[PDB]
Structure formats: structure tokens, C-alpha cells
UniProtKB/Swiss-Prot annotation:
Post-translational modification: Subsequent cleavage after Lys-125 leads to alpha-trypsin. Further cleavage after Lys-170 yields pseudotrypsin. A cleavage may also occur after Arg-99. Not sulfated on tyrosine residue(s).
UniProt keyword annotations, A-Z: Calcium, Digestion, Disulfide bond, Hydrolase, Metal-binding, Protease, Secreted, Serine protease, Signal, Zymogen
Pfam families registered for this protein in UniProt: Trypsin (PF00089)
EC number: 3.4.21.4
Subunit structure: Interacts with SERPINA1.
Principal localisation: secreted
Protein name: Serine protease 1
Species: Bos taurus (Bovine)
Cellular compartments per GO CC: extracellular space; serine protease inhibitor complex
Cofactor: binding details: Binds 1 Ca(2+) ion per subunit.
Entry's Gene Ontology molecular function annotations: endopeptidase activity; metal ion binding; serine-type endopeptidase activity; serpin family protein binding
Regulation: Is inhibited by scorpion cyclotide trypsin inhibitor TopI1.
PROSITE patterns tied to this protein: TRYPSIN_DOM, TRYPSIN_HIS, TRYPSIN_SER
Binding site residues for Ca(2+): 52, 54, 57, 62
Amino acid sequence: IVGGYTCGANTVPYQVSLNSGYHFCGGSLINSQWVVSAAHCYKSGIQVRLGEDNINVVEGNEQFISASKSIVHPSYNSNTLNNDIMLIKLKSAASLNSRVASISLPTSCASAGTQCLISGWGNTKSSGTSYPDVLKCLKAPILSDSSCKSAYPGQITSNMFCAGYLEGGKDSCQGDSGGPVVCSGKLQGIVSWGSGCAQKNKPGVYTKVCNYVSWIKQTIASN
Ligand SMILES: [Ca+2]
């Protein structure tokens, strides 16, 4: 997260870190057994880390639980990033309390202009590299589909939205991928892609979660 703020420990209780020996992506806990992330985050050997603040220090609220299964969206295209969504099942159910908690799926799609909270342990610099150890947060509005398409000609599908600031300076970034965009207490987006980070006229692009609720629910019901 570039241009954000330190969230505060366990203030984003649905935020998870996906770990294979190191943090590599974010995700969102949507019930005691299941995490939503980006398909482009797929790999084998995932350990889900819940209750994290500093990902390099054991602070007392962590739950580390290995994934038993991953399910990449059936129509995920890694070239265009269309349908950049995946489900990860935990080998055992997480213990839910105020510091570790699921986030609700949307009942309807959020609109341009709605404020959301984007969070992650990704790079904090637009030029060069610095990774924070604690969770970073950014409040950002959803942008119009027109401005989104104008920013990225020929690249924005019906399964994507832009959020952030056309002026630059405030954005998600490398290492934030798969993490949440939450608006009015609902998971509305997944950190997906963008051209660098926090560049002028290159806002972040996010997976449009509301399009996937039926797939998520059905998949969970049978796995
Ligand atoms: Ca920790």
C-alpha cells in the first residue's frame, strides 16, 4: 500500500496473509473454513496466516492453518486477468473472535463514489521498494467505469473495477494482491492489478466480487 496509514493491530480482522515460507499475497476470510484471494496468487503449499499484524513477529493473536484445497475460478485468464479470483479452504476451521473474523459477501454491487478500505503488507513505495512489517490501510473511492476504461484502454472487463486516485500517490501495490477492498462492511473487491503503483492516471484495478457470489456460495456448499 502506497500513501496509506498503519491500520493498527487486528483492526482488519478478516485480513489474511498467504504464506509459503514468506508472505506472498493477501486474502479475506469469508467464513471459518474459507478464504477469498486472487487467482494470480495461486500456488501449492499455502499456509493461511490469520490474526496478523507484524508478519515477522509472533505477537499473540495469530492462527496459522495450512490450506487443504485451492479452487481457481473456472474462467480465470492469466493473460487478461479476467476472473482474478480463487478460493482457499483451510485444513481446520479458524477460531472466530473480535480480532479474527469473517467479512460478509455483498448483497449487491457497490457503485462509483463509494468509499472503501484497502489493506495489505505490500510495497509502500511507487519508485523502488520497501515492505512494511505491519498491516497498511488505504481509504479510497471506487472510480467510474468510464474513467477506469479511459485509464486502461481495452483492458477493463465487466469483472473489474478501478479504485483510488487519478492524481496518483495512493494505491495498492506488489504484495497486496489477493487482499480485500471492503465497502460498507462488505467485500466488494480483490487487489488484482495496475500499471506500477500510485502513478498518475493508473489507478488500482480490482476483481468485482459481487459478480462471483453465486459461484462462491455454490463452491463452498460442495467442497
Ligand atoms: Ca505476527
